[PDB]
Ligand binder design. Structure first.
Ligand code: NA
Lengths: 152, 138
């Protein structure tokens, strides 16, 4: 090897009046940005229109195969669909010493700030799961099966 | 006549029984001992809402009382066990942390080891903002 293998993960906008989030604009942005650093080599640019589906999954498989050392992505909200998936995929990369760099938030997931990200997400996810569970139990009680308003 | 640092504790308490370490009186003892270790600190109050352990089923009257006391200038900092045992969701965590921060009132989340007035607190606010944005976008 030698060079750090750098990928980018992109969410592509469904229009058009948003050229900045177009596929082509993002391909050029990341290709040029990663070329700024001669210690790095571009692995690939991965993009789905919209964790997120097919190219995200291709990226994860390339990570499991040792093709990528660091993934750029614009934001947590583009990286994955929810807290639980953000945890899952950040941790899966981290166990293999693969960093994600969240550009908007300015967080490399392998730093102590990365560790705090994961602590905060774990607490957030526990609360979200308990909230769903509470809401499900409340919802069951709302259903009228005693002939409250209408007889049998 | 400069007053000691006025420390509140926010707690979700259990009436079970099978969980007496989460009782009101166990919590009073815990925070009494902590504040005793620091001669420059004084208890503002214990703020405690009854809640079912391992759940988000919780009262909110004391949380509201605490927020009012913070806005009324009675409290310099708030200890609380966890993000998941404080406000009820992400948007509310953001709302209340920001409101306290605007008044320079620190919350210390004990399990996460996050003081909301430090750089870690700035990180907490960005990560929570991202979680909220992530919901909106997905
Ligand atoms: Na004291």
């Amino acid at each position: 090897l030698e060079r750090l293998r750098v990928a980018a993960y992109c969410r592509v906008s469904t229009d058009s009046e948003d050229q900045l989030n177009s596929y082509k604009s993002q391909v050029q942005y990341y290709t040029d940005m990663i070329k700024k650093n001669k210690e790095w080599v571009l692995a690939d640019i991965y993009a789905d229109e919209a964790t997120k589906r097919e190219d995200f999954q291709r990226m994860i498989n390339d990570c499991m195969n040792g093709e990528i050392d660091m993934v750029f992505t614009k934001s947590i909200s583009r990286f994955a669909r929810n807290t639980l998936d953000t945890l899952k995929y950040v941790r899966m990369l981290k166990e293999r010493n693969i960093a994600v760099y969240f550009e908007d938030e300015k967080i490399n997931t392998l730093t102590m700030d990365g560790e705090l990200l994961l602590v905060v997400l774990s607490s957030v996810a526990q609360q979200e799961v308990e909230n769903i569970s509470a809401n499900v139990k409340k919802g069951l009680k709302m259903k009228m099966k005693r002939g409250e308003l209408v007889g049998f």
